[PDB]
């Protein structure tokens, strides 16, 4: 699910025009957030539990 969600947002970052810049913010933010959350899920939550 992490890989799917991260891959979903990349294609719209390479668009052309102003919409490309608009979509870049969302793509970067959400993809990096999801990747960091996945990293924490396999690292911190096991020890916490």
């Amino acid at each position: 699910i992490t890989l799917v969600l991260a891959a979903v947002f990349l294609p719209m970052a390479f668009a052309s025009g102003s919409v490309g810049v608009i979509y870049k913010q969302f793509t970067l933010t959400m993809s990096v957030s999801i990747l960091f959350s996945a990293l924490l899920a396999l690292i911190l939550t096991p020890a916490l539990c």
Partner: protein, 148 residues
Amino acid sequence: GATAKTINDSVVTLIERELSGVKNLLYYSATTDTSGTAEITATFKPGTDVEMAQVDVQNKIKAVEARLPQVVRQQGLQVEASSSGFLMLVGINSPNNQYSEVDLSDYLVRNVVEELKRVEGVGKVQSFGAEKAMRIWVDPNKLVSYGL
């Protein structure tokens, strides 16, 4: 020394033809009026280096300098980065009417505009006033009567 039509015919059309070579050019427009000046605005692709575009328009516009009317050449052409909107309006007003519009504009240009330009991030400071100067209002009738 030209009317709007003449500036359009011999300045605007000549300069706009060199814009095709410029890289990352989306569209270009030109405007002239009965004011003795013409403005050609070129828009580039979103997310591009403005300084590179400016230098690459400055280089391209020299192709027509020899062909441009000789009178136009001396004054020259100014290529600069353009923003479409304002950010702040800094004003000086006299509640007691001690100073008039001329004096307020003179003070604004003399002591404030340059200082505001020093502010970090300021791109342009456009003063809607004018500096002080010696105006000689001549009467043609008196001059012709005196032979001058």
